[PDB]
Symmetry: D4
Subunit: 121 residues, 8 copies
């Protein structure tokens, strides 16, 4: 099963980061969420109730990304993957990519980050 | 067999969407179609009759994307995958990605959507 | 005097638009603000009090862009230009560009909009 | 008066061109339309009837761009500028930029074209 | 073994195409070549003679892309894959992607094409 | 008179440069040519003989850009402006922009170059 | 005289900013330098000694951008414009644009900054 | 285990290359580093000591990329992969992609390079 529902380049201004200055100033966090969901029933029925509502998924990510500042990106993605897997039984597995395109790293790059993949139990 | 014929970033202005306002205003739908087709005979012969005509594939997608408004993206991709698989025996499997770069979702993102993969029976 | 302070590609999700569906669904509004300000004193002193704080300008634009839905883009830019000119005597003139990259216009384009230039009296 | 209403990157698939093969195959024409219009009344009133409707302008350009194939780009822009100036008295002057990003020119470039500016008499 | 040598976005102005007008006018062909090559010896030695010279590979592709006009893209990629596999024993497998970003297809898309993967015998 | 004919992002691989290594290795030169030409007659007639053929202009630039290696970019643009002004009486003035996006300058930038404007005598 | 020598998108990681956290963490500063210089003699002679060496200009900007942290962008551009005007008599006027694409401003934008133009006395 | 820590588009100005002129002039090297690391503990704890510090990884790559000029890209990636694997036991495998977007290759392309994948023993 290779069907997926996706949310790309979600951007939130947050204050996460292991550095005090980071939590003080904050920055933009870019998020990519991919959900493994069998989309054949919805493909057949065309009934929104037979699939996962991207809108509700963006609200979940947003609430975690725009809330309490944490240290790691690993923690933020773990909470999101867990939040989505928890509320949706149709999501067989959740992939969360978080990128800090502008960390307090002296240099020239496009970004740094982490990406986790969690299966729904 | 990893050979493929592709159609990227196809864009159509449609009126699909589960929201009444969506069907009223409409929006742009971005489509990516990938077909698994063994391209060795055509690679050998150079005869257009030994492969699938990208042009005819764009016409199929277009007819579905620019026609009757449906609710889901899942339904639109299911119809396209089914339409292409049905008319072409050389297409071993069809992958359809549909993206709503500008849905009625209050926020900052690059887009949302679904992607299905269907083998040709 | 060709000195300027600028704010590019400001993006807000608003509900302005002459169409009921627009006000219902909303969309992203892209804003570009250019202020004619003589930056020599600040260039000499390096004292933030000798120039206009881009931060405070983004807050002004934001408050207008994320507030009450209006019909025209002309109205939104008129309010911003007026809001900035009013609070800052150092701003000799304000240029406001507002773009609807995704209006309810069936077609393929990069965007539509208006740009006004207002001198500060 | 520096106020303007704009339509950027309008793209139409047409068959214009001085070469027979061009008229046969056709290509994509990119269009940029800028109109000098005093937007203060609309900025004050917020009444759509006090300005020029971008939507109606895109329809005008479209009708000319997607209609009868002509030889030059100069002819296409002349017809558009003339069509817009003619129907709208509020448009003090019209600027039309037409680009052939992919002409039958053997080489590497981003595009070629023309841009005209016509005042409304 | 996941090591690879790559050549991205190679662009050639050619006259291939199943349509007479295409062969007459010509267009730009974008090419992506990926070669599976074990790069550990070169990684150890730092001797250019222990790996495949990207330069020589671009010359091979170029000669095929800028030469005799053929009908299919499948034929062009088959000749390149075959040309590279043939001259280099270190290339375990060759992947060739050819894209016609501007075919004689009336519509809006980013491109169409084919991609083949050939193992070296 | 604000009418113009343009050629953007022309790219040639040349060997110009004041450094011996430059002339040895060569690089890509990006060129932008803008010609002030009154396009009303052509806009009226639609006869290609009433305007300047972008194709012939690209050939002129190409011949200078892909020919003998010189030291400066100033010299290359001077020769092009002079070559175009000389052959076309309809060109009232020529603007030539040449960019070295990748000069032998240790650093991070988008490019360096020169742009000249020459009126046709 | 419209001739110019330019340096675009120069990027330096600096620690300027009126906020303590800024000076602590630092960020990337994007710089655009435009110099009004009559390039006809160099265009005629092709002698590098008849124009301004872009390389030496990038070194000047770099030294100021990568040195002592200051508060304003106005101060940084004032020092650069002054540094370039001072050492080069051929530079009739200097234009310096500095952009903070990622300031400590909670929001979505492409960047903020200032641009000054200084004539050489 | 599909978890990864990444560093994209790292850019360094180096002097590596098998050609004398290359070592003389130098160029920009673009680097992409992907590390397979189980990020669940850090996702649970939120303690930076339970994962690999992207910052320290960029310093490692930088030291190799901005140091002694070598001949091959294969050698540079081998040293980096080896340097990262060596210092971090949590890194199960390292993927290094190095690209020369502007090699001394006469032509039009986006870049050339190599990518290696090394498991940590
Ligand atoms: N995996 C992970 N996830 C995060 O969110 C991290 N944040 N930091 C982090 C925290 C504090 C400072 C820095 C940092 O400064 N990185 C670049 C750098 C700069 C300097 Cl001057 C010195 C060093 Cl050692 C590193 C990084 N490391 C992380 N790893
Ligand atoms: N899988 C899928 N496919 C589609 O085509 C969908 N369309 N919508 C959809 C329909 C109607 C409204 C919205 C929507 O508004 N999403 C964002 C949003 C905004 C607000 Cl204010 C509130 C909520 Cl709950 C969601 C989404 N969900 C889909 N799922
Ligand atoms: N100057 C200006 N500013 C705005 O904010 C505008 N909004 N609209 C506007 C309002 C309502 C609908 C439309 C619209 O639909 N435009 C495209 C279009 C589609 C169709 Cl199907 C038919 C027409 Cl006539 C126009 C535009 N015109 C504006 N002009
Ligand atoms: N101003 C203008 N506007 C247009 O729309 C034009 N179309 N052509 C045009 C017509 C037919 C062919 C070509 C063309 O082929 N240009 C490139 C070229 C290729 C070759 Cl092989 C030879 C030459 Cl001389 C030119 C251009 N010149 C124009 N000028
Ligand atoms: N696999 C493959 N490879 C190629 O290189 C092809 N070239 N064409 C091709 C040849 C001639 C014309 C067209 C074409 O016009 N495609 C779009 C189109 C336009 C119109 Cl008006 C009508 C149709 Cl049926 C198709 C495509 N099909 C290919 N398939
Ligand atoms: N106006 C102009 N036009 C050109 O084409 C130029 N080419 N060079 C040029 C020639 C040779 C070397 C360099 C150069 O290396 N520039 C960057 C640089 C690097 C180093 Cl290590 C040292 C210095 Cl001083 C400059 C530039 N200066 C020019 N000016
Ligand atoms: N002209 C100019 N130039 C600079 O370099 C500036 N730096 N700052 C500056 C300094 C310190 C903080 C901020 C800032 O935070 N801006 C955004 C902002 C965020 C919040 Cl939470 C509150 C406010 Cl008032 C502003 C800006 N204003 C400048 N003006
Ligand atoms: N795998 C690999 N890695 C590198 O870093 C390489 N560098 N070169 C390399 C070295 C010297 C010159 C050239 C080169 O010039 N390539 C293009 C080219 C130009 C010309 Cl005129 C002639 C030829 Cl044969 C090749 C390439 N080949 C490599 N292979």
């Amino acid at each position: 099963m290779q069907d997926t529902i996706f949310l790309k380049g979600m951007r939130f201004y947050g204050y996460h980061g292991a550095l005090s200055a980071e939590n003080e100033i904050g920055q933009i966090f870019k998020v990519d969420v991919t959900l493994k969901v069998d989309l054949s029933e919805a493909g057949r029925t065309d009934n929104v109730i037979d699939t996962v509502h991207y809108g509700e998924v963006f609200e979940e990510v947003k609430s975690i990304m725009e809330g309490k500042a944490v240290n790691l990106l690993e923690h933020l993605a773990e909470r999101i993957a867990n939040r989505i897997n928890s509320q949706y039984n149709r999501v067989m597995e959740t992939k969360v990519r978080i990128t800090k395109e502008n960390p307090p790293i002296p240099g020239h790059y496009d970004g740094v980050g982490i990406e986790i993949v969690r299966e729904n139990k």
